[PDB]
Design a protein around this nucleic acid. Structure first.
Ligand SMILES: [Mg+2]
Ligand SMILES: [Mg+2]
Ligand SMILES: [Mg+2]
Ligand SMILES: [Mg+2]
Ligand SMILES: [Mg+2]
Ligand SMILES: [Mg+2]
Ligand SMILES: [Mg+2]
Ligand SMILES: [Mg+2]
Ligand SMILES: [Mg+2]
Ligand SMILES: [Mg+2]
Ligand SMILES: [Mg+2]
Ligand SMILES: [Mg+2]
Ligand SMILES: [Mg+2]
Ligand SMILES: [Mg+2]
Ligand SMILES: [Zn+2]
Ligand SMILES: [Zn+2]
Lengths: 69, 114, 91, 135
RNA sequence: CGCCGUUCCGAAGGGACGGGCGAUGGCCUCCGUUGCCCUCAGCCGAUCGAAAGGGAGUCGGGUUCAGAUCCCCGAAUCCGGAGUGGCGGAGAUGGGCGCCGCGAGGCGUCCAGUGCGGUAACGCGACCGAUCCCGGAGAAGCCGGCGGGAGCCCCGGGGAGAGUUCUCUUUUCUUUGUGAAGGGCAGGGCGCCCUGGAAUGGGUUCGCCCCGAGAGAGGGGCCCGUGCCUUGGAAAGCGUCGCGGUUCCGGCGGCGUCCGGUGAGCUCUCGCUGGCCCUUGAAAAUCCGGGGGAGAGGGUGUAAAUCUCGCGCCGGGCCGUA
RNA sequence: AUCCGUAACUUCGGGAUAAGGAUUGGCUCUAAGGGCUGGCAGCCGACUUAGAACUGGUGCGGACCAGGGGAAUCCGACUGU
């Protein structure tokens, strides 16, 4: 697994031809966006709940999304 | 206390059957088989007892998948000869080549007188 | 404090092998385990690695020496003899 | 007396350029506040011109005669001085210790030593300077 | 019948960068393949020989009546291949002069460009190069002492469940996770660098041992980091309480998975230093670095040769496994 | 196990746990032996040793574990087979 620091780099990862899905995981302290690519599971950890919703809308259309519970 | 077993059919404590204990997410202790300890290169000078610096200490077949930067030093002979003995060879090569000119000049002068 | 009266280093052998053999081997045991002054670097580090092989820990030089001593009387004499014959050979 | 003077040919003993021949541009025997030790600004041949022979054509000789230079400040203890002196006039307004602030000036400093060396190389003078030390 | 012999009484190479002559094809542009000749060429011994030696790379969870590091879930990784092997990034993109413009910059020419940083140790994401040559790793005994890290044990508290309770016991018992791989940081080690120059010698270990061939003291660099944090990852596992179903569901919910101490302790491991030898404690496959510089690449761009860098694409057959 | 003590002979290493004595429980104390933070103060701690009182029907290495000793002679030096 690889950890992504910035939102821009995660969006580039989310648009990759090999990206297979994005999982949203909500914890008490953060929301984790994990995109399953060919080699690595990339994870973006966001501590601002507001930014998580803004990012959740920005995800690529075709890329399948799953919210974990 | 929990007691361990090998996870392979080699029941003997040989150099290739070394292990370390590992607690898992299942909260149990299992064996993980370790890799042998790699060695940094030995200086090509055959004199300096220490090993070289700036080079990964890995098993010889792991070097194949490392980039070049991890296997040498940015310097002449770098990654194969120590810095100390590269300074000596530069002086030795220069200083010896000067003496050849000194000896050649004396020989020419002696022949000139003769 | 002085711990033994005469055995010294061959006190490791206890009562075994006889006084004269232990007396003989004492001379060798001291010499073969001594550290000699290295003539290449001056530090008292010349130590025996194997029989006939002496190594200096400082300058890392290795020397073909005697079995139990750094250089033998026979080898020292031969070096002077070879030195003298060399002068006469070329005068 | 003192001999580490501008124009003196020195051998780089330590670092990325060990074994490369250089020439003292400016010498600071007393050091400074930034470098309390003795140091000199030198210019040196990063890559030497290749051997050329009469069998080679004009365009091939020019290709093999290109020199790659470096500009460095060195501790005196990292240099071996030689008896050779090499009097290329290196413009000190461009090749000076202030070139280590921005790469734009350092590129000009290295370009300056590249041109002056190549011009001096083609005359056949200072042959020893332009031959790599074989150690 | 055969036996000896294994480099010894042997024309023991069927290979190659490159070059020149042709022949065939194709994404027919020009490149492959292919035949011959030239050039170059030590290996010097076929072959077999280890399920404990050498030898790249897989871990966590679940699952059966019986198999699981092999099945399923999840997360990885080595090797090989693809130049129709794709996309980024690197090579890479600068300067002089002359015009135009207030400038930002734009045009025309002429030159450079097989990366860069550090005094250094050495660092950075790559960072051309063949025959040939040098070296490293694989690859090295036994014993002692000491130190670091773990697992376990122990001690003091918080929970959760259980035992005892005639008397006492804020009590006794159980249990109280986080893999590989990547990143960061502790910790450990250095016979690594720079300044400097030390006797009124000093530093220093359990022991030693170290210094003008550079000590103390400062400031750096490197190697291992199996330890901690982080992605993995709470979604899982476990504890306990409570609900459902066909009720043979990876069923669904609440809560918890917490905070410290200590040791010549035991086991494993990593490291430092010593002792012993008329004892000196494998070889090879395999992989790597360096030295050299035969060559190749483009003429300022639609940039090229090239890249051990980041992604991406395809595959891993055979036998064993209760 | 602690404390004391230990000969002949000797190849000076031994002999040697020579031989020979005394002590040992339980309980309540005393002293000494350290670390961290800021000749002192506070806060933490790890088992040890020595000494004393009291105490039991003199029992106390309470089971377990655990060398009898000395003086000589023959042979072989020894360890090893
Ligand atoms: Mg094996
Ligand atoms: Mg861990
Ligand atoms: Mg390196
Ligand atoms: Mg075989
Ligand atoms: Mg095998
Ligand atoms: Mg698999
Ligand atoms: Mg020092
Ligand atoms: Mg849970
Ligand atoms: Mg080279
Ligand atoms: Mg089985
Ligand atoms: Mg007796
Ligand atoms: Mg008698
Ligand atoms: Mg006998
Ligand atoms: Mg037998
Ligand atoms: Zn060396
Ligand atoms: Zn020496």
């Amino acid at each position: 697994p690889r950890k992504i620091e910035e939102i821009k780099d995660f969006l580039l990862t989310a648009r990759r031809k090999d990206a297979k899905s994005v999982k949203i995981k909500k914890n008490k302290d953060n929301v984790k966006f994990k995109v399953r690519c060919s080699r690595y599971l990339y994870t973006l950890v966001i501590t601002d709940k507001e930014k998580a919703e803004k990012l959740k809308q920005s995800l690529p259309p075709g890329l399948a999304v799953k919210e974990l519970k | 206390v929990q007691r361990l077993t090998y996870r392979r059919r080699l029941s003997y404590n040989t150099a290739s059957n070394k292990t370390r204990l590992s607690r898992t997410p299942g909260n149990r202790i299992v064996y993980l088989y370790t890799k042998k300890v790699g060695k940094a290169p030995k200086s090509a000078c055959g004199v300096c007892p220490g090993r070289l610096r700036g080079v990964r200490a890995v098993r010889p077949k792991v070097l194949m998948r490392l980039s070049k930067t991890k296997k040498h030093v940015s310097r002449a002979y770098g990654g194969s000869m120590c810095a100390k003995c590269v300074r000596d060879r530069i002086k030795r090569a220069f200083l010896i080549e000067e003496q050849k000119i000194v000896v050649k000049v004396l020989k020419a002068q002696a022949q000139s007188q003769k | 404090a002085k711990r033994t009266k005469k055995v010294g280093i061959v006190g490791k052998y206890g009562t075994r092998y006889g006084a004269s053999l232990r007396k003989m081997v004492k001379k060798i045991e001291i010499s073969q385990h001594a550290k000699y002054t290295c003539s290449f670097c001056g530090k008292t580090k010349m130590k025996r690695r194997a029989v006939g092989i002496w190594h200096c820990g400082s300058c890392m030089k290795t020397v073909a020496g005697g079995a139990w001593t750094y250089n033998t009387t026979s080898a020292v004499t031969v070096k002077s003899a070879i030195r003298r014959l060399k002068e006469l050979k070329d005068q | 007396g003192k001999f580490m003077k501008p124009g003196k040919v020195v051998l780089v003993l330590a670092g990325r350029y060990s074994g490369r021949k250089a020439v003292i541009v400016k010498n600071i025997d007393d050091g400074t506040s930034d470098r309390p030790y003795s140091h000199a600004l030198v210019a040196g041949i990063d890559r030497y011109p290749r051997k050329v022979t009469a069998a080679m054509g004009k365009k091939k000789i020019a290709k093999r005669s290109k020199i790659k230079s470096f500009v460095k400040v060195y501790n005196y203890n990292h240099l071996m001085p030689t008896r050779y002196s090499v009097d290329i006039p290196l413009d000190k307004t461009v090749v000076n210790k202030d070139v280590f602030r921005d790469p734009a000036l350092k590129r000009k400093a290295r370009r300056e030593a590249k041109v002056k060396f190549e011009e001096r190389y083609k005359t056949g003078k200072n042959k020893w300077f332009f031959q790599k030390l074989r150690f």
